[PDB]
Amino acid sequence: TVFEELKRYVGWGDGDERALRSLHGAAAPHFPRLAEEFYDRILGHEGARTALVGGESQVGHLKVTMIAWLDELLGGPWDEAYWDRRYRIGRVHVRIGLPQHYMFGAMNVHRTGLARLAYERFHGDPPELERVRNALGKVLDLELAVMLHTYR
Amino acid sequence: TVFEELKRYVGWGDGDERALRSLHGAAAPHFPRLAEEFYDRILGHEGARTALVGGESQVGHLKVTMIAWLDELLGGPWDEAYWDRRYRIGRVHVRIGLPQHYMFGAMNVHRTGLARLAYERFHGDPPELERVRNALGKVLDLELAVMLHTYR
Ligand code: HEM
Ligand code: HEM
Ligand SMILES: [C-]#N
Ligand SMILES: [C-]#N
Ligand SMILES: [Cl-]
């Protein structure tokens, strides 16, 4: 499978899983803010905003599901069940006809916010910041890999 | 096209371009190590390694073109001609039959190395680190977006 092959490629291990779970504790209180920044970016962008046409209640419901998505991202586990669920999430966006390039822009918003949260928490312990930064890069690149698999 | 719509989405500006140029000077002496790490990952991966059966000269030539790719990544400019060349690079990999998910694994190797060099150079100035780290995330995400466009 794509996730198994890529876990091997990127050197995914228990270290990455521990480091993400450490990040989860630091980041979870800020999930509402990360979701807010994510939708602010979609709604502020002329092309992306046209994908959201259910109004104020729609963004409210999407924030709830994105808080859950972030919780799973950093909490795991990152097993076949997890990745199977991520394929289904990719397919959702294929089916609504969302142009695939928006997935990269959107993931970059989370990448930027999560990287900042990692730095804020871990900068005083550089080797742990390195481990958390590295794990975060891997999980987000694997998420993209799996969600762009659904577009083919 | 995808670079222009996406550059607005991620907030690509002259600040990102200055940050990347500033990293270029610090990172460039380490490009050969980054390239070593990149090819060692391919050669150590059961699926990906089969793409490199052209011998020591193929790997040697690829290292040269990767050092150049990296120099362009951080030095720029990031103009129409740059992105047109990135499109052609993407198509090379489509033409040779490389599975698209390997592009994510391979980009992660560079992401991890480049993020480490950014920290090494800029950790004494946390606001500049933030700018450099943000710009690095954006350019790599844009690179993946363009590469994956060629696979469509
Ligand atoms: C990193 C990028 C993204 C992630 C992680 C993400 C995550 C999700 C999740 C978890 C769902 C719910 C799927 C379910 O029902 O189980 C969903 C649905 C949706 N997402 Fe996203 N999403 C992303 C990008 C985007 C973008 C860029 C847009 C629009 C600009 C978008 C618009 C939507 C819409 C409209 C739905 C609801 C679809 C429907 O059922 O009508 N998403 N997303
Ligand atoms: C971030 C990911 C990657 C980047 C930035 C990259 C970059 C490049 C560049 C700049 C070239 C030269 C293009 C040209 O001569 O016109 C190229 C060619 C090539 N790449 Fe990659 N590459 C990536 C991923 C991969 C992976 C994962 C593999 C194999 C596992 C691979 C195997 C090759 C091969 C075999 C060629 C030569 C094709 C030929 O014979 O003409 N590349 N790549
Ligand atoms: C999409 N939330
Ligand atoms: C391609 N190295
Ligand atoms: Cl950092």
Side-chain angles (χ1 to χ4, degrees):
Chain A
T1 60
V2 165
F3 65 89
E4 230 163 312
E5 269 202 286
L6 282 193
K7 279 179 151 190
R8 294 187 335 255
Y9 201 115
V10 306
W12 186 275
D14 291 346
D16 295 301
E17 301 195 355
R18 283 194 300 279
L20 293 174
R21 289 194 297 263
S22 300
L23 186 54
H24 180 280
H30 304 286
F31 291 168
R33 189 176 49 73
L34 292 175
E36 190 179 347
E37 292 162 356
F38 184 94
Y39 299 98
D40 285 352
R41 201 71 64 81
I42 288 166
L43 296 171
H45 181 273
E46 295 147 73
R49 176 181 42 229
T50 55
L52 302 195
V53 294
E56 256 156 22
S57 286
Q58 173 181 50
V59 167
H61 288 303
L62 293 171
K63 286 172 176 177
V64 174
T65 49
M66 188 57 69
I67 290 161
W69 188 89
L70 290 164
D71 188 64
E72 291 173 296
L73 184 78
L74 308 182
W78 298 271
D79 57 353
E80 188 155 16
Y82 176 98
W83 295 109
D84 284 346
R85 287 190 293 276
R86 297 328 211 197
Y87 189 92
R88 289 195 269 286
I89 289 160
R91 284 207 318 253
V92 168
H93 298 87
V94 182
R95 290 167 173 167
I96 66 178
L98 182 67
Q100 74 176 44
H101 70 280
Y102 291 129
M103 302 308 276
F104 293 95
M107 196 65 83
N108 185 261
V109 181
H110 282 328
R111 190 189 299 284
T112 303
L114 290 169
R116 186 188 149 289
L117 286 169
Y119 177 87
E120 270 27 77
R121 180 48 67 81
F122 296 106
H123 70 274
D125 187 5
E128 185 72 0
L129 172 59
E130 179 169 53
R131 284 186 285 275
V132 172
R133 188 169 68 234
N134 288 352
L136 175 57
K138 292 177 192 185
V139 74
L140 293 178
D141 287 346
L142 268 45
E143 288 278 358
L144 282 173
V146 171
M147 286 188 285
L148 274 284
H149 192 71
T150 67
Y151 275 92
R152 293 298 162 261
Chain B
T1 186
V2 312
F3 57 97
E4 290 294 313
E5 208 151 55
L6 216 47
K7 272 184 286 168
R8 284 192 271 104
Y9 196 111
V10 307
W12 184 274
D14 298 339
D16 296 297
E17 298 187 2
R18 285 193 219 95
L20 287 184
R21 282 190 207 104
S22 179
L23 179 58
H24 190 207
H30 305 271
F31 292 169
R33 182 188 157 168
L34 294 185
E36 287 300 309
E37 290 165 348
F38 187 93
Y39 295 104
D40 283 352
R41 203 67 65 84
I42 295 166
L43 290 171
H45 189 265
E46 188 171 282
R49 72 198 186 196
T50 69
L52 301 186
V53 294
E56 291 285 11
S57 292
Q58 180 188 49
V59 176
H61 285 306
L62 285 178
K63 287 168 178 176
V64 176
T65 55
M66 189 57 65
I67 287 167
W69 185 89
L70 289 165
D71 217 79
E72 289 146 10
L73 185 76
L74 303 187
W78 297 270
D79 60 0
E80 178 175 83
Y82 174 105
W83 294 111
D84 289 354
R85 199 174 109 67
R86 298 323 208 205
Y87 190 78
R88 295 185 226 114
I89 291 162
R91 296 197 279 90
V92 163
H93 301 86
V94 179
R95 198 158 287 107
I96 71 191
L98 192 77
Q100 73 174 43
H101 63 280
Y102 295 159
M103 302 311 289
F104 292 97
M107 196 66 80
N108 188 259
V109 179
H110 283 333
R111 185 186 306 280
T112 304
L114 288 165
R116 181 192 37 91
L117 292 166
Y119 180 89
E120 287 167 1
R121 174 61 182 81
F122 296 104
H123 68 283
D125 190 356
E128 186 66 0
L129 179 53
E130 187 178 34
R131 289 192 285 279
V132 175
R133 181 178 69 234
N134 293 356
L136 181 58
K138 293 177 197 185
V139 76
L140 295 172
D141 286 344
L142 288 172
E143 289 280 355
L144 287 164
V146 168
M147 287 179 175
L148 274 288
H149 187 68
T150 71
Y151 274 94
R152 293 181 63 243

